[PDB]
Design a binder for this molecule. Sequence first.
Ligand code: NI
Length: 312
Amino acid sequence: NGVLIPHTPIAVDFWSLRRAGTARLFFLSHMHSDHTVGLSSTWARPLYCSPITAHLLHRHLQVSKQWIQALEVGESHVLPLDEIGQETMTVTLLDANHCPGSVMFLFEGYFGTILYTGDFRYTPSMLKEPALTLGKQIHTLYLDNTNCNPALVLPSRQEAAHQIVQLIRKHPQHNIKIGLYSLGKESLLEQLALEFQTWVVLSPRRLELVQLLGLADVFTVEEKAGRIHAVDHMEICHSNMLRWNQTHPTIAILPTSRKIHSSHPDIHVIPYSDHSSYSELRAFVAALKPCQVVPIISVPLIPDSVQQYMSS
Ligand code: NI
């Protein structure tokens, strides 16, 4: 899902080195496991991400802080595009509403004005951003088209949370297992501690993420402290259901955005989305008025100092 912006040394969510070649500036929109393969402690090329994303990157992939130029969201920053003090480029990061520390990259330079949305959840608060309200003409919109496919309809983030509450409402005497990825859906955990008036059980790593975000003190790591446990999504399987059901009558919930058949009756696959709906995007593009939209073309005039930067 990485993107090499053609005729630029720009790479967003791309870390293959050998497949890039021309790339010299690598951006990280958010810290989901799917957009970061090749990133580790051996990574030694400049990297730009959001504040929260900077903490999560150094801590959980052991990436050296010397390669992580973290920039504040909302503000525009001047990045070099060569080895001399000549060409530069402005980047403005915009909150993506997708997950903790998720951003949208807005580039400006010899290539034009490119807006990279990455993964993002649309809300009309996004149009009111000062970066996109100066009437600037975006030349290319690398847009999140996840829910633009006409295949299978996934409910919104709030529709799925309603079904989860109805599910636990019908099982008041049950232990609830919730499978998640390494990031996202922490605010949903908060909504379940309120509705059901329990403490939510996490792993120590997940507890660190939550305190990093500034959420309510409704979480704990003691197993016996609550009926709702948050576990890794790869834990929810037929073998583990029998293991949990041997102790206490347990229900398992899998919030996923893919077609999955429950391999156990007490496993409930709930369709999540976490991306903008089609109509939300069609109003998002009708407001931006971009010259062209690219899913996740014109060749610019590469300067002399930038053409050398790409070939070393
Ligand atoms: Ni993501």
